[PDB]
């Protein structure tokens, strides 16, 4: 099956029948338990949605490529409201060079440690064979409405032997997703008056991709395999007016249609793989270096996340992330039959950001212990990690899997993440699974850094109108979550029916504080002696919901598949406001007809439930008027097909959003002065879009 309780596989064949425009989030998000959301509820950078597992937000979704972490979005400034102006980290690997994607949700993911509190998405690449194989894949879409950006994608792959004991695989991708027109949301925007008259909430940012990977696999002995690979990728955007608060100035407009951020991502990796009689071994060294080059933004109030015209030009933030990992697997023949796994992990995150720590104290007054100018650019954290997995077969069909993970964070201190996963054959066709683990979240280098400083004259200050500073806090605790799940699944002859309940009890969620810890001294007029808030640990939050799957073989050539997410609860237990904004439910429905030996046909529908905005503004006061707007449930239908011309050539064609259901970003969720809120109307849903594809392969 592609769906067990807590786990989902997406295969290469699924990627081909529901082709993504560009980014994989498009297909990853259709798995049970998975949403495409912002990190908190501000709606800021709302067209920049990323993969969320069980409403735990996308910072708690760990992205791997071939078992190796991607950390590149940790190069983008983390803002007051817990969003980054980032497209996330699911668009580094081109769709057509993916072998399969593994999604692991909740208690079975806690064993991966830091930032798997929601789950793990592991994007697996196609590898060399015993002979030389390769492909050339091209995709091109055509929106009905010209405003919305079309997507074009060309990727090759090429793998094979060199000697009997030397293998290689290489691929290369070139792609572009045109931005939405600067004016797509015109006539849909929230009410904008005074200074903010004429402002617009932006459509989807465009991106240009360039990806190149080379891998050499070397098995210098029957038991011993040694892999070296390098990765070079480059994303440059196409700017279409997006700003944190949806305000505008002249620099913004100058940059419509230009590259305003470029991410270069370089990965080198050494991997040694061992199989002998005692069992199985694996250890890797990955060096990920991310350069985030983008136009300087302001760091104060309504100027937070708008191009700063007084400091025009590009800065470059540099993220050097170092990962080494060791694991063994030992089969044991004991009172109960079992398999033991022993592992260390070492990581280093160096962040050089020459822009983020430049907010000065001339207006709100100075902060004892914080220099007002020329503060360090530098942040780092090392985690050391030890873990052991025991995979115990009590009686055939039954597995009990206890694991202990211990992590030493060189600032925050010690974390203990224990876990237990039970799976039970009640019948040869029915299987019960229960799991309770405590997952782990290290504060990001922005939250942690006493040199990282935002400012507001009041409009963004919790429980007051006065000027206030928000400050990094190296005193922070790690976020932990006791992810519980109880689930049942019938599976027999491609008939699959399953339903899982999950509850994550969420401790110490890090977030902009609610009480001043202190007050600065000096500064200008009514702004002087501003209040000082830090990044605080929220004592308690809860997420809760249901994951379902149902697969029926209607006839031999014909398969009816369904995945269900239903989000029961998502609650900051301090304020009572929501954590994320998700659709109440999500049903993805595919009919797959194998019409001929050669012709396959696919109809899909996605139903999205209601979406409700946050109840409280930045003050902690109740929002009013269009800040309360909700999005009604809506559905998106699509047809496609793939006509195989030969062993060497396949063609695809179809239509996303058959009935042209469209939604428009009205702005952020709450009111500010001159910019009415837009409630849950914070993203653009594209209309009818034709697409065609071609895959040539030996
Ligand atoms: C095997 C079933 C176990 C028992 C389930 C019922 C237990 C309900 C517990 C009481 C609280 C509940 O009534 C309130 C609530 O939940 N909300 O509002 C709603 O809660 C809407 C619906 O009632 C729940 C939606 C879940 C959809 C279930 C689809 C099942 C998929 C089929 C599997 C093949
Ligand atoms: O969305 C927010 N702004 C909007 C809406 O707010 C406004 O337009 C006005 N605004 C206040 O009246 C305000 C009254 C009482 C208190 C205020 O803070 C006001 O700003 C004027 O500010 C501005 O025109 C600009 N603003 C600064 O230059 C600034 C410079 C330094 C420091 C600032 O705070 C600045 O606003 C841009 O502000 C905006 O576009 C917004 C969000 C989050 C937090 C904010 O503070 C926001 O203001
Ligand atoms: Fe302000």
Author numbering: 24 to 721
Publication passage describing the model:
In Gram-negative bacteria, Fe3+-siderophore complexes are recognised at the bacterial cell surface by highly selective outer-membrane TonB-dependent transporters (TBDTs). These transporters bind the Fe3+-siderophore complex and translocate it into the periplasm. The structures of pyoverdine, pyochelin, citrate and ferrichrome iron complexes bound to their respective transporters FpvA, FptA, FecA and FhuA showed that the ferric-siderophore complexes were bound inside the barrel adjacent to the plug domain, a position thought to be poised for translocation. Pseudomonas aeruginosa, a serious opportunistic pathogen, does not make enterobactin but does possess a TBTD outer-membrane protein PfeA, related to FepA, that binds and translocates Fe3+-enterobactin into the periplasm. PfeA has the same two domains (22-stranded β-barrel and N-terminal plug) common to the TBDTs.
Soaking of native crystals with Fe3+-enterobactin prior to data collection resulted in colour changes in the crystals. The data collected from such crystals revealed additional difference electron density that could unambiguously be modelled as a single Fe3+-enterobactin molecule. The ferric-siderophore is bound to PfeA by residues from loops L2, L3, L4, L7 and L11 on the extracellular surface, and is partly exposed to solvent. The side chain of Arg480 sits between rings I and II and makes electrostatic/cation-π interactions with ring II. The oxygen atoms O6 and O3 of catecholate III hydrogen bond to Ser479 and Gln482; O5 and O2 of the catecholate II hydrogen bond to the main chain nitrogen atoms of Arg480 and Gly325, whilst O4 of catecholate I hydrogen bonds to backbone nitrogen atom of Gln482. Comparison of the Fe3+-enterobactin complex structure with the apo-structure shows that L4 has undergone a large change (6.3 Å shift between Cα of G325) of conformation in order to interact with enterobactin molecule. The change in conformation of Glu327 of L4 results in the side-chain reaching further inside the pore to make a salt bridge with Arg100. In the Fe3+-enterobactin complex, the peptide bond at Pro28 (β-turn type II) flips resulting in the formation of an anti-parallel β-sheet rather than the α-helix and in disorder of the TonB box. We do see a correlation of movements between the binding site of the Fe3+-enterobactin molecule in the extracellular loops, the top of plug domain and the N-terminus. This suggests a route by which siderophore binding could be coupled to TonB engagement.
